[PDB]
From a paper:
HP activity is regulated by its first and rate-limiting enzyme glutamine fructose-6-phosphate amidotransferase ([name], EC 2.6.1.16). [name] is a modular enzyme composed of a glutaminase domain responsible for hydrolysis of l-Gln into l-glutamate (l-Glu) and an isomerase/transferase domain that catalyzes the isomerization of Frc6P to glucose-6-phosphate (Glc6P) as well as the transfer of ammonia to Glc6P to build glucosamine-6-phosphate (GlcN6P).
The [name]-1 [name] crystals diffracted to a resolution limit of 2.77 Å. While Arg203 interacts with the backbone residues of Ile178 and Leu181, as well as with Asp279 in wild type [name]-1, these interactions are abolished in the [name] [name]-1. In the mutant enzyme, however, the side chain of His203 protrudes between Asp278 and Asp279, without affecting the orientation of the neighboring loop (residues 277–280). In contrast, UDP-GlcNAc dose response assays revealed an ~6-fold higher IC50 value of [name] [name]-1 compared to wild type [name]-1 ([name]: 231.7 −15.2/+16.3 µM; wild type: 41.4 −3.5/+3.9 µM). In addition to the observed gain-of-function caused by reduced feedback inhibition, the [name] substitution alters the PKA consensus sequence of Ser205 from RRGS to RHGS, suggesting a potential change of Ser205 phosphorylation and a subsequent loss of regulation. Here we present the [name]-1 [name] gain-of-function variant and decipher the two consequences of the substitution: first, [name]-1 [name] displays strongly reduced PKA-dependent phosphorylation at Ser205 due to a disrupted consensus sequence and, second, shows weaker sensitivity to UDP-GlcNAc feedback inhibition.
Numbering used by the authors:
A (entry chain A): 2 to 227, 244 to 294, 301 to 672
B (entry chain B): 2 to 227, 244 to 293, 308 to 680
Write the structure that this text describes.
């Protein structure tokens, strides 16, 4: 699930320091969930590091990384004070798929009892059955029920059947991946190629970080097919960081290379080259900081990411909104904003909360672009073979940028010649690369299990795009100004909503024992219902459902009685009167609902017992304020019930 | 709501023959509103019926009509033996969407403490608040909170300031409607005008039935402007039946006059004048041998399906011809998008046929909930084809969307089950699904008939594509076999009733499907909500992994739909995810799905049909399941709480 490897080339490091780096690397990957982890490093206790490069030691264990950290330092036959001028250590966290969690089934997987080759793997090898039969017929005995082991045994098969005594480590791996089917991110290590690393991916992220106090030969690595590689110029010293997630690299360096499918990256004599069976891979700078993946003073990542939303919203608008002259500029669309305006339809495709962001901005997109806006769930979009045309603009909302159904929707539309735009939050992700253009919502990494700041950052990003699509219309200047003053005031308004956290805990204690809750709303807050009810489902495990208010009299209103908890959303927009009508329909049937409304709606505050009173904003922005109380309610309910809000489940 | 009045002119009826005709008229209209009821007739106990038309009696009580039928009887003041030669009586059942359903709020309303004018109203007055303040200043005291009272206190204000001593009852009503705003259907009665009735409409149905053993003077009453009246030629014997619907009159006669907007009908001296045969058998509105309309309407779907295809599908030569579209089909193919607009179950019928509409028309298909369609002011264009699905043809939100689309030059199509309904008239063209009257509040045969209709339309849109000839043949053979396969499903009634005994106590249930059965699980979830009051929610199977799956444990009831179409494997993956969360689901599957039947305890095995027709079969069990669950919980399936049928306000 998580991969991290640390190669120090002519940068002296003691075995203690190497192990602490690997463990610290896995600590940055734990948030993805896992059941076991392991490390691989050169063994032996010969004081000269050059003689220990033929003994690979492994320490794998089922449990948390801490237990692994304890097992590392709990080795009597291991001297931690040996200094290695050159060394490659690899680490891995496992999410079991093939084989039950156990030390044997943990990574790194070895090629034999002498550990001539070891490999860490993220993904699944579909044809591991056949590959295992073939290697067993050639005389290789397996010890684990993991598909990963077939990789270790196979690379040794190529090595044992090499035509020349000096075939490259790269050539060996090329022959392995050419026999593999499915998805995989791999890092290899071998006693026969000491100090060298080989990384390759297909359908799984893999990146390489680099650091050196010396100048590097290039910032754009060219691809080599079967002056050209990356290395420090005047000296040898250099450090490489293979990782499946930037979060494990950023504290050491912000210079990274994102590998692409079928890339085979190799480090030989401290020089990094990328082979493939003038295109090149860029060495780019990440704007990510270690502080963005730490809880800080908060007790959970969920709490942090909700309460930091005044900051994340500001990070989303930075360099993109100019309140001094009411102009909007998404740099990611400069070379495509012209074509997009000559198109005839917008299609927003996403899963889960990302899809709700589409619903939350569909109206304002229709208002300002005057174009048809169709919001689709990616899985259903694929089932129906939806008609798509060359003059369609297709947005793909995805925080991770790797969600399969959304990604497959992306590739579907590209085949039909539509113009594709990625709204992502993960640099280097598949959806950010394969779209024609895109916007990075720059909300910072989302470490929590549920989407909190990503939903509101997507909300803001799509509103900003809408503002770009009508920057030439005289009749809409006023409307644009109204909206951008609302964005100017939004962060302060979000703080105001968070300052009512106390009022929300009271509501949580009132719903502590409840099993169902109906969340009602219409117009700009239809999405607020759905997203609220999804959060309370995902985090609290109670049956929260979002009900479009205009639909009550067509059936759903039958659930209302004096026992069914109800939360209604009644804001000061054009649907105010209609929402009041829905409230009367509920109360008329013995419903006693909790209402989320504007601070100054004196009428409903008096006639309704419990009301959450949020500040008034622009109609097409209220959704951001009205959803936060529901984020907090889901958070507090889970806490009251003893759940771990940072646990996937 | 419902309206019914009985005017017998020189046809001797005792006071019991009239009260049992008013109640029997409301029972025919009860399914339109059953929160309260009331009747209005002539009081007094004088043998000579003439000295009793100056005294009005109002018997109004809370509850269904059977609560009023007992309040009318066993009274100590009304002598049910007086013979009336001329008499008028008005009745009404109300849908109390607001306030309390008290006898004071029920209709008929009154204008003072002596009952000089009583009115029964179907609709809403959008300015009754201004009429209430104008009338309170002149010396009129109000009693109720309804908007109907402002119609009674105002018809008396025009009578207190007339210019001549004998102003016709029409003139008084003409002055009232000029001050009323919104929609309304009214039937007046006054002591000053004995035996005279006035019936005007504007945006709400209102017809007049007539019966007489004598010949009628004419068959085309001429509309007048401030050899003219409909009356028996030689004698005076005539019976009139004011009613907002045709079912309350078919039992007494099949000769009605469908009024129009702003037509002020008036019966004077037993002569019907307007100022400014029915094609239904009584059997169609009788439960027959079933204990409920909903059970009948479910088990009669084999016939209603056939009645939808009659004279429209030819299986010998595989031709589809919808007469209602012959003059527009050519222009519909030159359009560029399909939009389906509806509410509730009708909206589900759009979801259930969206995929096949996209396949056979190759056009974009967009399915919209009417209420949200209006809140967003959706972009619509002259080259859009907009369908409006409505069993009643009167649903307010759907109807407003129609007029919204006409204003934007779109080609509109009505898919209705009511001839003469607003939606069937105001659309450029349309199809009558011809399923028969639907009395049960929950739509059952209407859904499956709307389904078939949209499929027939799809078959027309592609009858000129060679490449789709085989696909057309496959679907039409499925239609030929569908009625019998529906019977095969209904034969599992007993098996469904059992599984209901295992769930009637639960509070929630999740229904999961994708593709062609996304609609199935939504419509099923709606039905269970509407008549069993369980918290049932439809969940798109593809979305489970994105949050809702967290709500599944060994306790949470789950129903899954897994059919043999292109999503079988994906549905199998969702089923494996559910079991991993310890779920124990009921699976609706195809009989030949042996793998599914072995590994799942509770299964409902339905016969295999064409993929785009399978939805009709997979939904019927949920219709039956909702029925049995309601019976187990002691509820009534023909009168669910908190609403009625057809949302016209
Ligand atoms: O609570 C929300 C979850 O995070 C989940 O619903 C998420 O929104 C989807 O899995 C889409 O993922 P992406 O946004 O990464 O595409
Ligand atoms: O089961 C519920 C009802 O059938 C309901 O969903 C109905 O569909 C709408 O209240 C109006 O729809 P029509 O306009 O077709 O009557
Ligand atoms: N399929 C491998 C790797 C899974 C992973 O960690 O992503 C296993 O189960 O061991």
């Amino acid at each position: 699930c998580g991969i991290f490897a640390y190669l120090n080339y002519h940068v002296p490091r003691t075995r203690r320091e190497i192990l602490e780096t690997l463990i610290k690397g896995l600590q940055r990957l734990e948030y993805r969930g896992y059941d076991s982890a392991g490390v691989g490093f050169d063994g032996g206790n010969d004081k000269d590091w050059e003689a220990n490069a033929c003994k690979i030691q492994l320490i794998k264990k089922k449990g948390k990384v801490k237990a692994l950290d304890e097992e590392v330092h709990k080795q009597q036959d291991m001297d931690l004070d040996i200094e290695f001028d050159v060394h490659l250590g690899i680490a891995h966290t496992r999410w079991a798929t093939h084989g039950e969690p156990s030390p044997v089934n943990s990574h790194p997987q070895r090629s034999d009892k002498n550990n001539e080759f070891i490999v860490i793997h993220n993904g699944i090898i579909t044809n591991y059955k056949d590959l295992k039969k073939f290697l067993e017929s050639k005389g290789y005995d397996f010890e684990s029920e993991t598909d990963t082991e077939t990789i270790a045994k196979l690379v040794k098969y190529m090595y044992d059947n090499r035509e020349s005594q000096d075939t490259s480590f790269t050539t060996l791996v090329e022959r392995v991946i050419q026999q593999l089917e499915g998805a995989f991110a791999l890092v290899f290590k071998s006693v026969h190629f000491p100090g060298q690393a080989v990384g390759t991916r297909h359908g799984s992220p893999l990146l390489i970080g680099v650091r050196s106090e010396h100048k590097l030969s290039t910032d754009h690595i060219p691809i080599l097919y079967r002056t050209t590689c990356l290395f420090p110029v005047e000296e040898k010293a250099v450090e490489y960081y293979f990782a499946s997630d930037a979060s494990a690299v950023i504290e050491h360096t912000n210079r990274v290379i994102f590998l692409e499918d079928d890339d085979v990256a190799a480090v030989v004599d401290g020089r990094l080259s990328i082979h493939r069976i003038h295109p090149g891979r860029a060495v780019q700078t990440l704007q990510m900081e270690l502080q963005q993946i730490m809880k800080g003073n908060f007790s959970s990542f969920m709490q942090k990411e909700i309460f930091e939303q005044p900051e994340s919203v500001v990070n989303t608008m930075r360099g993109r909104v100019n309140f001094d002259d009411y102009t909007v500029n998404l740099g990611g669309l400069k070379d495509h904003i012209k074509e997009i305006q000559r198109c005839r339809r917008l299609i927003l495709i996403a899963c889960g909360t990302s899809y709700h962001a589409g619903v939350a901005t569909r109206q304002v997109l229709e208002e300002l672009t005057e174009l048809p806006v169709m919001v689709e769930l990616a899985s259903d979009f694929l089932d129906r073979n939806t008609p798509v045309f060359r003059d369609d603009v297709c947005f793909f909302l995805s925080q991770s940028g790797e969600t399969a159904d959304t990604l497959m929707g992306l590739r579907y539309c590209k085949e039909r010649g539509a113009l594709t735009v990625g709204i992502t939050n993960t640099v280097g992700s598949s959806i950010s690369r394969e779209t024609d253009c895109g916007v990075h919502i720059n909300a910072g990494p989302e470490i929590g299990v549920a989407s909190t700041k990503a939903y509101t950052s997507q909300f803001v990003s799509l509103v900003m795009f809408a503002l770009m699509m009508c920057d030439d219309r005289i009749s809409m200047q006023e409307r644009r100004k109204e909206i951008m003053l609302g964005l100017k005031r939004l962060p302060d308004l979000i703080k105001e909503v968070l300052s009512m956290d106390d009022e929300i805990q009271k509501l949580a204690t009132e719903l502590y024992h409840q099993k169902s809750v109906l969340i009602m709303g219409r117009g700009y807050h239809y999405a607020t219902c759905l997203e609220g009810a999804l959060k309370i489902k995902e985090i609290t495990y109670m049956h929260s459902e979002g009900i479009l208010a205009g639909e009550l009299k067509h059936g759903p209103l039958a659930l209302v009685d004096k026992l069914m908890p109800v939360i209604m959303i009644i804001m000061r927009d054009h649907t105010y009167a209609k929402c009041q009508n829905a409230l009367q329909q509920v109360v008329a049937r013995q419903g006693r609902p909790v209402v989320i409304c504007d601070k100054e709606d004196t009428e409903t505050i008096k006639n309704t017992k419990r009301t959450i009173k949020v500040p008034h904003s622009v109609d097409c922005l209220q959704g951001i304020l009205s959803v936060i109380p529901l984020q907090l309610l889901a958070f507090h309910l889970a806490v009251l019930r003893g759940y771990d809000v940072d646990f996937p489940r």
